[PDB]
Structure 1
Amino acid sequence: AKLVRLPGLIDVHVHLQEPTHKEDFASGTAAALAGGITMVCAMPNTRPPIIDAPALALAQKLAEAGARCDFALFLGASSENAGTLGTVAGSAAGLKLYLNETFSELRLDSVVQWMEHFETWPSHLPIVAHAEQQTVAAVLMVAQLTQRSVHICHVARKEEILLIKAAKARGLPVTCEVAPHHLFLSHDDLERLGPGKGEVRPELGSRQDVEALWENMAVIDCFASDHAPHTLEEKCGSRPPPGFPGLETMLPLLLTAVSEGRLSLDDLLQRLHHNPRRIFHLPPQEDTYVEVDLEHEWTIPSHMPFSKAHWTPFEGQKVKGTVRRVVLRGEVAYIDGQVLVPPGYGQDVRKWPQGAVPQLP
C-alpha cells in the first residue's frame, strides 16, 4: 500500500529477436511494461541483422506493428557498412559495435574497422560498444583518436569499471551501463544455474567484481537489462547462446536494493530515466508514469509471466517491490499482471519531432 509514482523508465539494451520463437516485439515489450519500462532500445543482432537501410526499414515496420511500448532501433556495425549509413543514421537509436566474440555479420576483424566507423558515423549520434576487459581500453583509444564519445555496454568486472573511472578522471567522454545480473549474481550462483544456463557475455563476475561495481556506483551512468531471451532448450543445449532475460526482474531487484539502502531512489531514477535520456537523446513521454508498491515481498518464480524465454536466473531470490500500474501516453498499459495495450500501440521515438538528435546544419 502507499504507491510511489515514477516517470516512464527506459531500458537502452534489449534483444527482442524480431525479425521470434525466442521473443518478438509484442511479447518483449509486454515484459518491458510489466517491469515498469515504457521505452526500449532494441539491438541489431537479429536474423537478418540490422546492418543496412532495408533491414532497418523492415525492423521499423515490424516494431511499429508489434511493440506495446515506445522504442528506438539500433544500427549494427559490420565489416562492410562503414560510410554507408549516413542517410538513415539519424533514424536509429545509435550505432552498436560488437568488439568481442560474435561470429556473425557484426564481426569486426581489425581495430582499423572500428576507427572507420568512429570516423564515418555522424559525430553527433550515439555509438555503443560491447567491449570486455582490455577491449574497453582499446575502444577508448579509438574514441580518443577520433575525438568523440563512446558508451560501454554492460560493465561487469572490477577491471572494467576502474578503467572507466580512470578515463572519466582524465575528462574523457565515456559513459557506461551495468546490467542487473552483474549486480545481483556472481560465481557463487553458477553452482545452482549450471554451465548451460549460467552462460552470459560478459560472464558472471566474482564477488569482488560485484562489490567493485557497487562501490563504484558513482561511475555507472545507466542500468540496462541486456534482455537476451533464449529458451531453456537453447540455454541447456549443446552450444548454448549467451544472455539472460531480465526486463521483468530488473526493477524489482533494484527496488529491493533501494529498500535496503544500497542506493537511493534518485540514484535509481538517474540510471533508468535521466541518464538514458541525455546519452541517447531520447524524448520525454507525455502523460506517462509507473506506480510501484515498495512494501510487497515476493519470491522470483521459475519463470516470469510475459517473456517468451520462460526462465530466469534470479529464481528463488527474495525481492521487495513490484510494479502495480503503468500508464503510457494517457492509457493504462499494465496493471497487476495484465498488459492492456495491444501490439502496435508503441511508436518509434526517433520519428517524433522532439526525438531527433540536434545537429549543426
Structure 2
Amino acid sequence: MLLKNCRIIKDNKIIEGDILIDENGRIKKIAKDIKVDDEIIDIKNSLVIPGVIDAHVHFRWGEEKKEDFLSGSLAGINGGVCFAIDMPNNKPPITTKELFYKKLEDCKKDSKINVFLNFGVTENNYLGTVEDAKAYKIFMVKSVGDLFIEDYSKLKDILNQNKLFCIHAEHKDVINENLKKYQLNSWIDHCKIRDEKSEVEAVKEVIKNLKIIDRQSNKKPHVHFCHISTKEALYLIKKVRQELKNIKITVEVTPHHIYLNKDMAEELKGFGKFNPPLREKDDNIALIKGIVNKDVDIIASDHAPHLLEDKLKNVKNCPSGIPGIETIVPLTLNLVNKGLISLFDAIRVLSKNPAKIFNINNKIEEGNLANLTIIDLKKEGKINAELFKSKAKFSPFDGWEVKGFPIYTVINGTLYEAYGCKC
C-alpha cells in the first residue's frame, strides 16, 4: 500500500512525502512522489504522526457487558489510538502469573489494536516478575479484590525494585476521615470526600519513600503517577524531580481533568463522577501549563466504561469512571486549535513520550511496523457518543464541538477509517 501526499512527523519536523508499506505491514520507503504499481490511498496532505498510545485504559476483562477486547479495540481504532495499555483491576484482578496469561490469551484472540497488559501489585505478590507486563499498577485505595495496598508502611519495600510502577495516588486515611465528616448526598460531595488533599497526601507518601530509596538503595525504580489532577501534586512532583538522582518520575493527566471542573458537578451527574474527582478551574489551568512547561509527560484517557444503567443512578450507587478512548485525540487536538498547547506538545504527550516511557516503538522509520495516526487538524465537528464503538456510548463531552479529528488509524500496516472519516 502507498499512502500518497502525507505530511509526516519524522524526527521533529514536518516533511511532505509518500509512505510505502510493504505487505508485511512494514514501512518500506518514505520519499517524495513515490511511483510504484501498488494500491494507492490519497492522504491529501493530512498529518501522519507516530501511532498514538493511550497508556491508561480499562477494557473490563471478566465484565464483558461493559467492554471487551473487540469493542475496546474498535473504539481505539475509531479514536486514532494504535496502542493501549490495559489496567489489571479486573474481575478477578490480575494478581497472579496464571491470571495474567489467561487474560493475555483472550486479549490476543480479539484485539484489533496493539494492547499491552499491566500487572496488579498486592502486598503479597510485589516481588514477583511477569516478563510480558508493561508496568506494575499500585492502587493506594481499594479497587477490586486484594488489588489495594492497605499498609503504606510497605511502600518502601514495594518500590525498591528495578521496575516501572504506575500509581493511583489517593490517600485512604484522608478519604476515611472525610467520610466521617460529609454525607454522600449529591454529586459535589464526591469531590469533597476525595478532596485535593487526599491526592496530595498520597503523592507525598510515595515521594517520601522514593527519597529514601534514592539515597539508601541501588535500585532505580521508575514511578509513573496516573491521572494527576491537582496543582499542588504537580508542584510537589516538579520539586522532587530536582532532588532525585537515580529515580525517574513521570506524570500523566486525563482530558477530563484538563477540561472539566467541580462547578460542573451537579450538571454532569454520573458523567462527571470519576476518581480522582473533578477539581477547580485553577487545577485545569495548572495541568495545561504543565504540558507547555514539560512537567506533564503524557495524556492518557483512563477509559473506564460502565453500563449506562449504572451511570444514571444517584451519587451513592453510581460507579466512578467515564469512557474516553474515542475522545482523547480530538480533545487534545482541540487544545492545539484553541492555542493552549502547540502541535508538537500534543504529539509529545500523545505519541512520543508514551513511547519513550513504556518502550513502544511507534516511530515512522523504514523497516518498522507501520502504526500511524492520521489526523485532519482543522476539521471542525461535534463529538457524538452514538458514533462511539465502545459499548459505553455516552460521554460528558457528548455534543461538544471541537476542532481536530483522527481520520485514519494504521495498525501494523492495516488501514482503518477513524471517527473523523464519518464527520
Please indicate the TM-score interval, normalised by the length of the shorter structure: 0.7 to 0.9
Q: Deviations over 1:292-321 (max 9, x none)?
A: 112221122244421111210112222011
Match of 2:200 among 108, 128, 133: 133
Distance 2:255 2:349 in 1: 12
- Partner amino acid for 2:92? P
Tell me the residue number matched to 2:143.
102
Q: Tell me, yes or no, if the aligned pair for 1:304 and 1:311 is still in contact at 8 Å.
A: no
Q: 2:83 aligns with which of 7, 32, 39?
A: 39
Residues 255-334 of structure 1 aligned to structure 2 (within 5 Å): 255-284=333-362, 286-334=369-417
Is the radius of gyration larger for structure 1 or structure 2? 2
For residues 150-185 of structure 1, the C-alpha deviation after alignment (integer angstroms, 9 at most, x for no partner) is: 110001011111111111233462111000001111
Q: Secondary structure at the match of 1:248?
A: coil
**CA separation in 2, counterparts of 1:13 and 1:274?**
15
- In angstroms, what is the RMSD of aligned CA positions? 1.9
Task: Quote the Cα distance in structure 2 between the aligned partners of 1:117 and 1:187.
Answer: 34
Q: Which of residues 168, 179, 190 in structure 1 aligns to 2:265?
A: 190
Contact 1:303-1:312 within 8 A present in 2 as well: no
Paired position in structure 1 for 2:54: 11
1:57 aligned onto 2:98: no
Query: Of the candidates 149, 157, 162, which is equivalent to residue 230 of structure 2?
Result: 157
Separation (CA, whole Å) in 1 of partners of 2:73 and 2:208: 36
Structure 1 distance, partners of 2:208, 2:268, is: 36
Q: Distance in 1 between matches of 2:86 and 2:144?
A: 20
TM-superposed deviation, 1:2: 4.3
Matched, 1:170 2:262: no
- Whether the 8 Å contact between 1:5 and 1:290 is mirrored in structure 2 is yes
Q: What is the deviation of 1:337?
A: 7.0
Deviation at 1:139, TM superposition (A): 0.9
Cα distance in 2, alignment partners of residues 293 and 146 from structure 1: 46
Q: Distance in 2 between matches of 1:103 and 1:17?
A: 12
Q: Name the structure 2 match of 1:67.
A: 111
Query: Which whole-Å deviations, capped at 9, do the CAs of 1:59-91 have from their partners, x for residues lacking one?
Result: 1001001211012100001132122x22x2x21
State, as a whole percentage, how many aligned pairs show the same letter.
32
CA contact (8 A) 1:231 1:310 kept: no
Q: Secondary structure at the match of 2:264?
A: helix
- How far apart are 1:335 and its partner, in Å? 4.4
User: Normalising to structure 2: TM-score of the pair?
Assistant: 0.75
**Gap change, CA 1:197 and 1:259, over 3 Å in 2:** closer
How far is 1:332 from its partner?
A: 1.1
Q: Secondary structure at the match of 1:133?
A: helix
Q: What 5-or-longer segments of structure 2 have no aligned partner?
A: 1-43, 170-198, 215-220, 363-367
For residues 314 and 188 of structure 1, the distance between their equivalents in structure 2, rounded to whole angstroms, comes to: 16
One-letter amino acid of the counterpart of residue 106, structure 1: L
Aligned length: 332
Q: d(CA) in 1 for partners of 2:222 and 2:418?
A: 39
Give the equivalent residue in structure 1 for 2:310. Answer: 234
Question: 2:256 pairs with 166, 171, 181, which one?
Answer: 181
The structural deviation recorded for 1:104 is 3.2
Task: For residue 265 of structure 1, report the CA deviation from its aligned partner.
Answer: 1.3
- Could you say what secondary structure the match of 1:104 adopts? coil
Q: 1:67 and 1:302, CA in 2 relative to 1: closer, same or farther beyond 3 A?
A: closer
CA contact (8 A) 2:89 2:144 kept: no
Matched, 1:80 2:124: yes
Bigger RCO of structures 1 and 2 (CA < 8 A, at least 6 apart): 1
Partners of 1:49 and 1:291 in 2: CA distance: 35
Task: State the one-letter code of the partner of 1:110.
Answer: D
With normalisation by structure 1, the TM-score equals 0.87
- Compared CA separation, residues 336 and 136, structure 1 to 2 (3 A): closer
Provide the rounded CA distance (Å) in 1 between the counterparts of 2:234 and 2:411. 34
